[PDB]
Design a protein around this ligand. Structure first.
Ligand SMILES: NC(=O)C1=CN([C@@H]2O[C@H](COP(=O)(O)OP(=O)(O)OC[C@H]3O[C@@H](n4cnc5c(N)ncnc54)[C@H](OP(=O)(O)O)[C@@H]3O)[C@@H](O)[C@H]2O)C=CC1
Ligand SMILES: NC(=O)C1=CN([C@@H]2O[C@H](COP(=O)(O)OP(=O)(O)OC[C@H]3O[C@@H](n4cnc5c(N)ncnc54)[C@H](OP(=O)(O)O)[C@@H]3O)[C@@H](O)[C@H]2O)C=CC1
Ligand SMILES: O=C(CC[C@@H](c1ccccc1)P(=O)(O)O)N(O)CCCCCc1ccccc1
Ligand SMILES: O=C(CC[C@@H](c1ccccc1)P(=O)(O)O)N(O)CCCCCc1ccccc1
Ligand SMILES: [Ca+2]
Ligand SMILES: [Ca+2]
Ligand SMILES: [Ca+2]
Ligand SMILES: [Mn+2]
Ligand SMILES: [Mn+2]
Lengths: 408, 408
């Protein structure tokens, strides 16, 4: 009866939101069993979570804090968890027959590995990590074609919104990242809403001067926070939309909705538009990924539309946010251009965060790597396709670093 | 799979909107056969219609233009219609094996009659007439419990909106106007959107002296326009929401949304809200009633959210719009109070339309009628129940008139 769940990246923003909504849902009845928690190196924060949730499995990626973890956990009386580490641990958890659903709240391209293995074990993958889908979308489509009972359920807020707007009567006849998804669901077009980030109203001259301090000083991972500022986040989410829902790029329209109430909208083939709305929130997206196709009761504050009072919508300027344009170009070009987009952005984002480059150098570096990349024949087998993705990802990161290094 | 449809009230606002969208959709591909058309007396209109759609059946209420119609239709070559008259014509059309769906665009408490026989013939009934639901809700529920394969599909725009927000895998486990509809669909609360009508920004002192001219001078027919001005339309729509969707009155919130793009919203038990949005329009509500649970391609203009730019929401003042309070009060008391509200408002509306009373006299008459009613033991017998509704309706109209004449 309980839904058996793993939380990967349990100590981050998504992971902590997941555990928060699970805690509330488990007050009276045993709705969810937290069977596994996995982190990189936050061994103290993992210990505190273990003390509360007492999962069968704990896993740390960083083997150097494995002893610390083991030492900490022996303070918890009558608790005998399976304590694992690294990729071997991740795969052991994905293989467990005692796990139904896995929340992927690991950041960056790194989230791909556990997403892949979750799929290969026919799990429900509640995927917040968008870099996986951007970098490896065609590959995930192939994996999901092989592993017939695996499913990706979107957690990224706009993609959860879109998914919620659909008729589950049709959703149930397909699954995300499957050819024909949009046909089966009668999808015509997507309005992909955006906060527009901190720099949305700056002039060109002002935007030239922005720094990461400006962008940093809502609340979440720092990487996604810089991506929100450049609107590369929205760029990635465009490609995420394409893959998840089989919607053509010309039918994805970015809309800046600064009140962040309408989370995104779906236009059907009759031109009726359905939208999902709430306060800016990740608890509903996370919970829904784990209850779909059902909903369960929460005690979240109800939307007070009268108090919100006013909702606004405008088109983003591609001159001010050229990262959006680069993401459409990469997506439309297909092949491995999204891999290269994602990888070069990982580097450009980090350079800007650490005050090494300017705002417009972000899009400049990305554009330059994209222009440099030569299309490659797509490997027909899964294993070769994955190695190909890894090689191109690494290449693109090194290329971006080399561009940075050469022009300074 | 032809969709075989009858239009009742074919020459009215709902009716021509229905034939409009059928005609346009059929240009894209032939999905609809208009199998029957019915009107009151508008016989040149029906002729022109019948010439275009060439339906199997034609029917006109009034005997006194029955022969005339037949004269008109001899013109049309290669076309041998079944041409009928009055209630026998209606009953005959409802009983035809050829006909699958019936749009009810007949207005006023009168509209109940065709609805009943549509249900008794186990049809899909696309019901725009809200007064039928308000006056006869409990009876329609009983009738739909007997006729298991009959279904009401909402056409009133807000109720169509709500219905379109739902997951049809849950809808298909129930149907509208059934106990537990909201439970099965995990509905927590409704935001019922309103234009607010013409008087939305007037002071109490200004409302004292408004005339029907002020209300009449979105162009619609006079009765619903006056109800929109008093917001009794929305009061009626609150009760309609209650019966259609089994939502408690304290979970229905009227919100004034003057741009009329969001047509209404559904809050689920997780506090997620879904809404339907389009330009103010009856084509999609009618269309969806005939395609449900599917959608088809239209050539309607796509919503341009950027251009709309701003959406606003505020709570209506119950002091300025006391008809809303009266509707909640009648609904909450249950029994036949909704019958009484609807009937008394038919009279009060008409009095104000004809400059016989003032704005606040509308709510005052309705209030006094409601006060004079005593709840009645509800007949368990279907036939007796319909007699009770007719009697109470007629009693309430008489009472409202007496109150008017006594003070006047
Ligand atoms: N935050 C949000 O609201 C939203 C996030 N997302 C997406 O969700 C993902 C996570 O973002 P967010 O939670 O902000 O990120 P955080 O930086 O807050 O957290 C990342 C988590 O992943 C863990 N982790 C990192 N590397 C590994 C690894 N190799 N093995 C195991 N665990 C690892 C971290 O562990 P440790 O603590 O040990 O470092 C941490 O628990 C991103 O892809 C982001 O785009 C999408 C929508 C919104
Ligand atoms: N108009 C709108 O946009 C909306 C309408 N509705 C509801 O829809 C219903 C219809 O509204 P609307 O179309 O504005 O009304 P109209 O007055 O515009 O239309 C009346 C139509 O019904 C026909 N009719 C009336 N009585 C009979 C009868 N006894 N037998 C056969 N046909 C009859 C008329 O025929 P004839 O032409 O011969 O007179 C005419 O075609 C109302 O209950 C209203 O509340 C609700 C929301 C939106
Ligand atoms: O991609 C994103 C973040 C980036 C987008 C964003 C930012 C801010 C508001 C709305 C949207 P962007 O449009 O600027 O790219 N989301 O999907 C998360 C939106 C829920 C944020 C609020 C929250 C509450 C609690 C915990 C954690 C987070
Ligand atoms: O109940 C109603 C009419 C009353 C409500 C209303 C009025 C005006 C706009 C939106 C809503 P109210 O909130 O004022 O009570 N609808 O359901 C019709 C709404 C689709 C109108 C589109 C249209 C087609 C033709 C001519 C003109 C307009
Ligand atoms: Ca150590
Ligand atoms: Ca849905
Ligand atoms: Ca298209
Ligand atoms: Mn997002
Ligand atoms: Mn309406």
């Amino acid at each position: 009866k309980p839904i058996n769940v793993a939380i990967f990246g349990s100590t981050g923003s998504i992971g902590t939101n997941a555990l928060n909504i699970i805690r509330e849902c488990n007050k009276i009845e045993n709705v969810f069993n937290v069977k596994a928690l996995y982190v990189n190196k936050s061994v103290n924060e993992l210990y505190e979570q273990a003390r509360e949730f007492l999962p069968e499995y704990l896993c740390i990626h960083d083997k150097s804090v494995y002893e610390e973890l083991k030492e900490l956990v022996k303070n918890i009386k009558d608790y005998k968890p399976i304590i694992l580490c690294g990729d071997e641990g991740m795969k052991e958890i994905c293989s467990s027959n005692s796990i139904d659903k896995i929340v992927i709240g690991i950041d960056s391209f790194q989230g791909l590995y556990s997403t892949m293995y979750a799929i290969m074990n026919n799990k429900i993958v509640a995927l917040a990590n968008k870099e996986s889908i951007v970098s490896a979308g065609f590959f995930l489509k192939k994996l999901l074609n092989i592993h017939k009972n695996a499913k990706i359920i979107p957690v990224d807020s706009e993609h959860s919104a879109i998914f919620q707007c659909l008729d589950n009567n049709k959703v149930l006849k397909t699954k995300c990242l499957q050819d024909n998804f949009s046909k089966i669901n009668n999808i015509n077009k997507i309005f992909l809403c955006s906060s527009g980030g901190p720099f949305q109203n700056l002039t060109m001259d002002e935007l030239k001067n922005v720094t990461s301090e400006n962008a940093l000083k809502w609340k979440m991972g720092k990487k996604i926070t810089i991506d929100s500022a450049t609107m590369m986040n929205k760029g990635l989410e465009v490609i995420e939309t394409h893959f998840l829902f089989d919607v053509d790029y010309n039918d994805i329209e970015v809309i800046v909705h600064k009140e962040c109430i309408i989370h995104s909208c779906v236009e059907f083939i009759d031109k009726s538009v359905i939208s999902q709305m709430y306060y800016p929130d990740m608890q509903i997206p996370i919970l829904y990924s784990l209850t779909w196709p059902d909903r369960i009761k929460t005690n979240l504050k109800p939307l007070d539309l009268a108090q919100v009072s006013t909702l606004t919508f405008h088109k983003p300027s591609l001159e001010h946010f050229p990262c959006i344009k680069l993401a459409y170009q990469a997506g439309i070009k297909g092949n491995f251009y999204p891999t290269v987009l994602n990888a070069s952005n990982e580097i450009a984002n980090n350079l800007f965060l650490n005050n090494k480059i300017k705002y417009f150098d972000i899009s400049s570096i990305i554009s330059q790597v994209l222009e440099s990349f030569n299309s490659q024949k797509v490997s027909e087998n899964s294993e070769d396709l994955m190695k190909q993705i890894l090689q191109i990802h690494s290449w693109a990161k090194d290329k971006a670093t080399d561009i940075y290094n050469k022009h300074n």
